[PDB]
Scaffold this motif. Structure first.
Motif, mmCIF file in Angstrom:
data_model
loop_
_atom_site.group_PDB
_atom_site.id
_atom_site.type_symbol
_atom_site.label_atom_id
_atom_site.label_comp_id
_atom_site.label_asym_id
_atom_site.label_seq_id
_atom_site.Cartn_x
_atom_site.Cartn_y
_atom_site.Cartn_z
ATOM 1 N N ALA A 70 -11.366 4.961 0.358
ATOM 2 C CA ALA A 70 -11.351 6.056 1.317
ATOM 3 C C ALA A 70 -12.261 5.808 2.509
ATOM 4 O O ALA A 70 -12.346 6.661 3.391
ATOM 5 N N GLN A 71 -12.938 4.687 2.556
ATOM 6 C CA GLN A 71 -13.864 4.425 3.644
ATOM 7 C C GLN A 71 -13.102 3.986 4.889
ATOM 8 O O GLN A 71 -12.281 3.074 4.813
ATOM 9 N N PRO A 72 -13.339 4.619 6.037
ATOM 10 C CA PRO A 72 -12.591 4.250 7.246
ATOM 11 C C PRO A 72 -12.751 2.800 7.633
ATOM 12 O O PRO A 72 -11.814 2.210 8.176
ATOM 13 N N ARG A 73 -13.912 2.203 7.378
ATOM 14 C CA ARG A 73 -14.104 0.804 7.731
ATOM 15 C C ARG A 73 -13.179 -0.097 6.925
ATOM 16 O O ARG A 73 -12.661 -1.086 7.447
ATOM 17 N N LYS A 74 -12.962 0.223 5.655
ATOM 18 C CA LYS A 74 -12.071 -0.577 4.828
ATOM 19 C C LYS A 74 -10.608 -0.266 5.093
ATOM 20 O O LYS A 74 -9.761 -1.148 4.941
ATOM 21 N N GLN A 75 -10.292 0.971 5.471
ATOM 22 C CA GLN A 75 -8.928 1.292 5.878
ATOM 23 C C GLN A 75 -8.546 0.538 7.142
ATOM 24 O O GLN A 75 -7.436 0.015 7.251
ATOM 25 N N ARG A 76 -9.462 0.470 8.106
ATOM 26 C CA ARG A 76 -9.172 -0.217 9.355
ATOM 27 C C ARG A 76 -9.158 -1.726 9.173
ATOM 28 O O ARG A 76 -8.345 -2.418 9.791
ATOM 29 N N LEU A 77 -10.062 -2.262 8.355
ATOM 30 C CA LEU A 77 -10.056 -3.697 8.106
ATOM 31 C C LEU A 77 -8.763 -4.128 7.430
ATOM 32 O O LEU A 77 -8.226 -5.197 7.727
ATOM 33 N N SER A 78 -8.245 -3.304 6.520
ATOM 34 C CA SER A 78 -6.948 -3.590 5.921
ATOM 35 C C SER A 78 -5.856 -3.650 6.975
ATOM 36 O O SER A 78 -4.974 -4.508 6.918
ATOM 37 N N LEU A 79 -5.899 -2.741 7.943
ATOM 38 C CA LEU A 79 -4.848 -2.659 8.947
ATOM 39 C C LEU A 79 -4.884 -3.851 9.894
ATOM 40 O O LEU A 79 -3.849 -4.453 10.185
ATOM 41 N N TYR A 80 -6.066 -4.204 10.393
ATOM 42 C CA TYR A 80 -6.167 -5.278 11.373
ATOM 43 C C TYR A 80 -6.054 -6.654 10.739
ATOM 44 O O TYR A 80 -5.582 -7.589 11.389
ATOM 45 N N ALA A 81 -6.472 -6.804 9.491
ATOM 46 C CA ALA A 81 -6.412 -8.092 8.821
ATOM 47 C C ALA A 81 -5.178 -8.255 7.954
ATOM 48 O O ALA A 81 -5.077 -9.256 7.244
ATOM 49 N N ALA A 82 -4.247 -7.310 7.992
ATOM 50 C CA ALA A 82 -3.084 -7.386 7.125
ATOM 51 C C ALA A 82 -2.260 -8.628 7.452
ATOM 52 O O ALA A 82 -2.038 -8.935 8.626
ATOM 53 N N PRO A 83 -1.810 -9.370 6.446
ATOM 54 C CA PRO A 83 -0.901 -10.491 6.699
ATOM 55 C C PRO A 83 0.476 -9.990 7.098
ATOM 56 O O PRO A 83 0.788 -8.806 7.015
ATOM 57 N N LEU A 84 1.313 -10.934 7.530
ATOM 58 C CA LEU A 84 2.574 -10.577 8.172
ATOM 59 C C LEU A 84 3.480 -9.776 7.247
ATOM 60 O O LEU A 84 4.156 -8.844 7.689
ATOM 61 N N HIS A 85 3.525 -10.131 5.964
ATOM 62 C CA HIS A 85 4.436 -9.447 5.055
ATOM 63 C C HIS A 85 4.019 -8.001 4.817
ATOM 64 O O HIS A 85 4.847 -7.179 4.420
ATOM 65 N N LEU A 86 2.754 -7.669 5.062
ATOM 66 C CA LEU A 86 2.319 -6.283 4.964
ATOM 67 C C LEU A 86 2.552 -5.530 6.264
ATOM 68 O O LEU A 86 2.844 -4.332 6.243
ATOM 69 N N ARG A 87 2.429 -6.213 7.403
ATOM 70 C CA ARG A 87 2.633 -5.564 8.690
ATOM 71 C C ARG A 87 4.052 -5.050 8.856
ATOM 72 O O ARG A 87 4.290 -4.191 9.708
ATOM 73 N N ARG A 88 4.995 -5.560 8.065
ATOM 74 C CA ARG A 88 6.365 -5.072 8.133
ATOM 75 C C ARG A 88 6.444 -3.604 7.744
ATOM 76 O O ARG A 88 7.259 -2.854 8.288
ATOM 77 N N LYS A 89 5.600 -3.175 6.806
ATOM 78 C CA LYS A 89 5.636 -1.792 6.346
ATOM 79 C C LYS A 89 5.274 -0.816 7.456
ATOM 80 O O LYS A 89 5.703 0.339 7.427
ATOM 81 N N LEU A 90 4.500 -1.261 8.440
ATOM 82 C CA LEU A 90 4.138 -0.412 9.563
ATOM 83 C C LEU A 90 5.272 -0.238 10.560
ATOM 84 O O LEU A 90 5.111 0.520 11.519
ATOM 85 N N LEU A 91 6.396 -0.922 10.371
ATOM 86 C CA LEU A 91 7.553 -0.790 11.244
ATOM 87 C C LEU A 91 8.505 0.312 10.818
ATOM 88 O O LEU A 91 9.548 0.476 11.451
ATOM 89 N N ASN A 92 8.195 1.042 9.753
ATOM 90 C CA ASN A 92 9.099 2.070 9.260
ATOM 91 C C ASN A 92 9.280 3.176 10.287
ATOM 92 O O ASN A 92 8.319 3.642 10.899
ATOM 93 N N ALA A 93 10.524 3.597 10.473
ATOM 94 C CA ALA A 93 10.837 4.726 11.329
ATOM 95 C C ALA A 93 11.835 5.620 10.618
ATOM 96 O O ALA A 93 12.674 5.150 9.850
ATOM 97 N N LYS A 94 11.735 6.916 10.886
ATOM 98 C CA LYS A 94 12.607 7.890 10.253
ATOM 99 C C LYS A 94 14.042 7.731 10.736
ATOM 100 O O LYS A 94 14.291 7.501 11.919
ATOM 101 N N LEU A 95 14.986 7.850 9.814
ATOM 102 C CA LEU A 95 16.389 7.848 10.187
ATOM 103 C C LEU A 95 16.814 9.227 10.661
ATOM 104 O O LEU A 95 16.292 10.248 10.214
ATOM 105 N N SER A 96 17.785 9.248 11.566
ATOM 106 C CA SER A 96 18.324 10.505 12.039
ATOM 107 C C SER A 96 19.012 11.235 10.888
ATOM 108 O O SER A 96 19.441 10.612 9.917
ATOM 109 N N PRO A 97 19.113 12.562 10.968
ATOM 110 C CA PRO A 97 19.767 13.305 9.878
ATOM 111 C C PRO A 97 21.171 12.819 9.576
ATOM 112 O O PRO A 97 21.586 12.829 8.414
ATOM 113 N N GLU A 98 21.913 12.387 10.598
ATOM 114 C CA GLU A 98 23.252 11.853 10.375
ATOM 115 C C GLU A 98 23.208 10.588 9.526
ATOM 116 O O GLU A 98 23.985 10.436 8.580
ATOM 117 N N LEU A 99 22.303 9.664 9.844
ATOM 118 C CA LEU A 99 22.210 8.440 9.058
ATOM 119 C C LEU A 99 21.686 8.709 7.656
ATOM 120 O O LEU A 99 22.030 7.983 6.719
#
Ligand SMILES: [Mg+2]
Ligand SMILES: [Mg+2]
Ligand SMILES: [Mg+2]
Ligand SMILES: [Mg+2]
Ligand SMILES: [Mg+2]
Ligand SMILES: [Mg+2]
Ligand SMILES: [Mg+2]
Ligand SMILES: [Mg+2]
Ligand SMILES: [Mg+2]
Ligand SMILES: [Mg+2]
Ligand SMILES: [Mg+2]
Ligand SMILES: [Mg+2]
Ligand SMILES: [Mg+2]
Ligand SMILES: [Mg+2]
Ligand SMILES: [Mg+2]
Ligand SMILES: [Mg+2]
Ligand SMILES: [Mg+2]
Ligand SMILES: [Mg+2]
Ligand SMILES: [Mg+2]
Ligand SMILES: [Mg+2]
Ligand SMILES: [Mg+2]
Ligand SMILES: [Mg+2]
Ligand SMILES: [Mg+2]
Ligand SMILES: [Mg+2]
Ligand SMILES: [Mg+2]
Ligand SMILES: [Mg+2]
Ligand SMILES: [Mg+2]
Lengths: 213, 155, 121, 50, 122, 81
Positions: C6-35
């Motif tokens: 829960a420490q912000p320093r460790k949350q941010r270090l995870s985000l900036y140091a994340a390897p490429l396969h983890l950075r994909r999860k940050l690309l999630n976007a909501k689908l439209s109601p139709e989709l």
RNA sequence: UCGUUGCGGGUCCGCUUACCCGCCGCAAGGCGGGGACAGCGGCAGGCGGGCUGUUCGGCUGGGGCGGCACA
RNA sequence: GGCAGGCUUAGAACCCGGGAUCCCCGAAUGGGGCUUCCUGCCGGGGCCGAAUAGGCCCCGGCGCCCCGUAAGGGGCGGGAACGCGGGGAAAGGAAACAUCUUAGUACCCGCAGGAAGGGAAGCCAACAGGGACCCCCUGAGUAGGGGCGACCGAAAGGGGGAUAGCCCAAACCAAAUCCUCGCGGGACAACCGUGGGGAGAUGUGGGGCUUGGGCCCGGGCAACCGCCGGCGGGCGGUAGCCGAAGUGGGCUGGAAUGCCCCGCCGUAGAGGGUGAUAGCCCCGUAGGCGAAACCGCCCGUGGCGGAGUCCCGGGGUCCCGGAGUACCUCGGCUUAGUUUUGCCGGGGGAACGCGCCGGCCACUGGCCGGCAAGGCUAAGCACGUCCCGAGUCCGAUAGCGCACUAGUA
């Protein structure tokens, strides 16, 4: 416990070079940085004169009998609207105090149903006070995981551990829930001030008669 | 619930006749004999056995008889036998250099006196107390500060 | 795998140091109601060739195709969310994926269909 | 010296290879954050202990 | 067999400042016996071997003689010896002892049901 | 063992006037190994090999081809020119 | 002085094998001399600024010498 | 965060597991090394060459000390701290200073493990009884040591963490023994059968371990003791996957997560990101699921060996039961150990179970407690290079010397 590194500012190679050189006789770097001051608390990069120590006693101990007398005193304050209102709770819509609900309430499992229970007992306005009152606190606490300061709303006292109502209410802003045998000063007098808006279940009140006495 | 042996605390001269009970190391062979067991059988049933103890206490015998009946009728489950369950002997390197041979053990004092009274044990024990500032090593000269203060405050 | 601390320093270090396969999860976007009713999933990582609707910012309400995804920056470029520099060239505004809604899905990739079946379940 | 041992000569070669500033495209790539090299030295001022 | 010079160890006279108690030479000995010194010197001559024990053999005017027993912990004959395994190492899996003990406990309870339960309840 | 060719102004002049190719090889290569490698790779005959170690730590060989083989032709064939 | 220190004969004589010294030999061992002495270890006494640690008081018409006005 | 050119849907990047490559120096190990480079012999190979000569180059072996019949095998160096043995101060304190303390500390030398060391009564007690050991709390700054000054300082006992007991030698038997290799069998093993070699009467092996044993007689299986770790099952670690609910109307604004109004989830309102302050935008959280491969733990089952070694009763009065040891004396270091701690060194030096040792000066008698001088032993305890979590800690002159191309220039 908190402290500094035991050798902080004390591990450079330094010595006082004495008098006669026209400079102050504080310790200085021995090598190529020579005249640069070192070690003394008044020098840049020097040791902290009186830092925190991990051996410092932070815990203020209290006698068991005295602690339990305070718990009983704090419990009694939950029965006075004057004390509860003075602590800052919204008590206008609460029918009476102490607020005792039937033991059947301990079977409520969903936050949605517990919300309905709070509304019909006049407790929801105080929960809303806590939900709206959450603020981003001033100062360095933000950097350390203390960004949010949240008001306290309702203490729910149940008969025993692992009843469904514990999970149904613990997600509300400012709400604490404990079994009666786990009552303590942290939930009964936040801020060190008596009078906490408390919802007792009928079975919890019965079990109370043999505790903290 | 496997019973625990009850033994008497040794009555010192200092006590002046006041006695008390305590939990013993194990049941004595005399107590086991009254319930028809030897040391091996009792240990196989999970009981702590003390073959050094000579006393036989009727309260220990009574507790053993009650619990054995429960076990032999399927009402109680004996714990694991009180015998070694692992064998872990490590290869030794440099026994002579670390003073672990008989000659080293003699010079360390371990042949003539107890480990706690050997000089190297005393050196290590006091070094730890001073490092952690534990007990009496939190204050150097504590005894003399107490002595002089008692004289002044009790004059 | 992103810290549990829960420490912000460790949350941010995870985000900036994340390897490429983890950075994909940050690309999630909501689908439209139709989709959402057609595919049965609520979110998908944005992909080049998808069509998104921008919901926040200066280009709010603009719908266009995703032309480029930057895993390192966690930004996407969308047709229409552009402007010109002083030399007259057309440049793209880097948009965070959490600010767009996917309105058309590029499903020509067999590997992408596996992700959908996993989330539809 | 005129008469060098090869081992010393190869340490001198390494210092010669490393004695240069970052290329200009590195300055551009880092937005002028990287402009100097710690291996940069002048033969008259910073002496190798070769 | 190890031969070494007897007498006190070679205590050195300090060559800098000392308080008078720390200046003496004669009569000051080592807390090591010559027997331990002999075992250690033997171990240096046989690197990798373990010293088991030693004993005194003879004295003369200048020398003391010891014999040191050393064992090679890498030899198959040594490894399985009940005494030498205490030096060379020994491993018995917990699954072996625990399984054997559990079986013995189970069989004992059945036997005691017949031959002891009546006497206990009688 | 051959790392590259040297195609400087000096090297090209030695190719035309003295029938020599200039190569950079591994620093531990000897004159014997250099001559064998050039003959095997390029099917020429080596007359002699002169070697030096540059101030940047690289071994350079001036390889003189025998009098039936052209250093200029070999460089053209290799496409290094 | 205790031990090293042994062997013959009546504290004395002798002996050599201990031990010591030298020569030869790669080593094995040989030759010569000394010899239970010497040498060496422990213990004890003496000499011992060769070396180690220290003490070289106070009052005082500044200190020092004196005096003791230091009990 | 540049310019190019490529790689990748024939599945890359990335993460995890397993492999490959791995220059020179380095314990460095053919020998040197005033330059991290040079050089020898032998065996094999290549090249120059008319040559089979000669020369040059490549590859492999060649350290010391040991164990082993040999084949073969072992030690060496490193690691942030922690552990074991030894050597071993002074400054300072005592308001000077020497005994003393500081301190068996700093530091040095040697040697181990993931912990080490300790550990199974020649114990403690006091006629009442405890019952291996280590570590924590206490006993206790008590007894005691000490220019009886400064100061130093236990132990038994009590409460806890944790719990575990065995072996070598000897009595008696006397080669019944172990190791190694070939062949056949045997879950890829142990082991069985056979043949060769080595060890072994200066004793391999059996037996034996205070509830003493050996020895003799009888009775009984719930015998006892040991070796292998195959097969099935389960769980855990080393990547990950799933996971509720607004991106609703208006306002301000470059941009809202803000304000006003209206909704919704909650086992999830830990926390972070996102164009200003977000439970419902995204990551996540409560909660749930997961491994081709590698590793660890547990359970069930399987294979095999021994000289009855196991349990109970009787008989014994015969045999065994650890030496420069116990003990005395002198010197010295040390210890609370004091006419009384431990040890080292010099000199002297036992007895044997009908004996020996201890019970705060020695001896005598009584009583009590035991069996030294051989070996092992899990758990419970120390530490922090490293991994994870937390924080009334600091916030770029602070905090580690270093938030950065810092142990760098
Ligand atoms: Mg600082
Ligand atoms: Mg306070
Ligand atoms: Mg401020
Ligand atoms: Mg103390
Ligand atoms: Mg100059
Ligand atoms: Mg001093
Ligand atoms: Mg040349
Ligand atoms: Mg003499
Ligand atoms: Mg003398
Ligand atoms: Mg002097
Ligand atoms: Mg004086
Ligand atoms: Mg004066
Ligand atoms: Mg005078
Ligand atoms: Mg070498
Ligand atoms: Mg080592
Ligand atoms: Mg100090
Ligand atoms: Mg002083
Ligand atoms: Mg002084
Ligand atoms: Mg351990
Ligand atoms: Mg151990
Ligand atoms: Mg001390
Ligand atoms: Mg035998
Ligand atoms: Mg998810
Ligand atoms: Mg979500
Ligand atoms: Mg004995
Ligand atoms: Mg700084
Ligand atoms: Mg600032």
């Amino acid at each position: 416990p908190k402290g500094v590194y035991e050798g902080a500012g004390k591990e450079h190679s330094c010595e006082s070079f004495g008098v006669g050189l026209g400079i102050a006789r504080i310790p200085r770097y021995k090598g190529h940085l020579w005249p640069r001051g070192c070690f003394a608390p008044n020098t840049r990069g020097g040791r902290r004169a009186h830092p925190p120590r991990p051996e410092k006693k932070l815990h203020e101990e209290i006698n068991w009998k005295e602690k339990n007398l305070a718990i009983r005193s704090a419990i009694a304050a939950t029965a006075y609207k004057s004390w509860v209102a003075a602590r800052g709770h919204m008590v206008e819509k609460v029918p009476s105090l102490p607020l005792v609900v039937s033991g059947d309430a301990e079977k409520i499992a969903k936050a949605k149903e517990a919300k309905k229970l709070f509304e019909v007992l006049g407790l929801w306005p105080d929960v809303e006070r806590a939900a709206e009152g959450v603020k981003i606190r001033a100062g360095k606490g933000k950097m350390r995981g203390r960004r949010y300061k949240e008001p306290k709303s309702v203490l729910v006292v149940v008969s025993e551990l692992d009843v469904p109502l514990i999970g149904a209410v613990r997600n509300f802003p400012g709400v604490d829930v404990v079994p009666v045998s786990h009552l303590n000063m942290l939930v009964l007098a936040p801020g060190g001030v008596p009078g906490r808006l408390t919802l007792w279940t009928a079975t919890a009140v019965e079990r109370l008669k043999g505790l903290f006495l | 619930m496997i019973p625990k042996p009850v033994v008497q605390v040794p009555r010192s001269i200092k006590s002046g006749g006041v006695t008390k009970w305590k939990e013993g190391r194990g049941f004595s062979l005399g107590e086991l004999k009254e319930v028809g067991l030897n040391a091996e059988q009792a240990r196989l049933l999970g009981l702590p056995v003390d073959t050094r103890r000579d006393s036989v206490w009727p309260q220990n015998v009574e507790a053993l008889r009650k619990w054995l009946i429960e076990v032999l009728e399927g009402k109680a489950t004996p714990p694991e036998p009180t015998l070694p369950k692992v064998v872990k002997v490590k290869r030794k390197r440099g026994r002579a250099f670390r003073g672990l041979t008989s000659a080293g053990r003699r010079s360390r004092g371990l042949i003539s006196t107890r480990f706690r009274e050997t000089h190297n044990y005393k050196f290590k024990k006091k070094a730890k107390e001073r490092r952690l500032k534990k007990r009496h090593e939190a204050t150097k000269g504590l005894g003399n500060v107490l002595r002089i203060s008692r004289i002044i405050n009790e004059s | 795998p992103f810290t549990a601390s829960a420490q912000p320093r460790k949350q941010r270090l995870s985000l900036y140091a994340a390897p490429l396969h983890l950075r994909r999860k940050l690309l999630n976007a909501k689908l439209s109601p139709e989709l959402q009713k057609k595919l049965g999933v609520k979110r998908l990582p944005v992909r080049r060739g998808d069509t998104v609707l921008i919901m926040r910012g200066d280009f709010k309400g603009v719908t266009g195709k995703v032309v480029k995804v930057d895993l390192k920056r966690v930004r996407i470029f969308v047709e229409g969310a552009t402007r010109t520099n002083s030399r007259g060239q057309t440049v793209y505004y880097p948009i965070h994926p959490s600010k767009v809604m996917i309105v058309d899905v590029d499903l020509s990739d067999k590997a992408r269909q596996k992700l959908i079946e996993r989330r539809k379940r | 010296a005129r008469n060098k041992p090869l081992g010393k000569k190869l340490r001198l070669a390494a210092a010669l290879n490393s004695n240069r500033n970052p290329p200009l495209w590195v300055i551009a790539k880092t937005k002028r954050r990287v402009t100097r090299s710690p291996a940069r030295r002048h033969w008259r001022r910073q002496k190798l202990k070769a | 067999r190890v031969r070494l010079i007897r007498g006190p160890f070679n205590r050195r006279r300090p060559d800098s400042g000392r308080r008078p108690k720390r200046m003496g030479v004669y009569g000051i000995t080592a807390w090591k016996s010559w027997r331990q010194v002999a075992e250690e010197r033997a171990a240096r001559k046989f690197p990798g071997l373990e010293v088991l024990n030693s004993y005194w053999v003879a004295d003369d005017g200048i020398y003391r003689y010891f014999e040191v027993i050393l064992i090679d912990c890498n030899q198959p004959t040594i490894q399985r010896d009940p005494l030498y395994s205490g030096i060379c190492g020994r491993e018995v899996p917990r699954r072996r002892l625990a399984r054997r003990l559990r079986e013995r406990q189970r069989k004992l309870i059945e036997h005691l049901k017949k031959t002891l339960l009546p006497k206990l309840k009688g | 063992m051959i790392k590259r060719f040297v195609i400087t102004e000096k090297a090209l002049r030695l190719a035309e006037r003295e029938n020599k190719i200039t190569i950079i090889v591994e620093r531990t290569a000897t004159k014997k190994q250099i001559a064998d490698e050039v003959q095997r790779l390029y099917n020429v005959k080596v007359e002699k090999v002169n070697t030096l170690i540059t101030p940047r730590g690289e071994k350079k060989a001036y390889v003189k081809l025998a009098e039936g083989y052209s250093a200029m032709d070999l460089l053209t064939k290799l496409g290094v020119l």
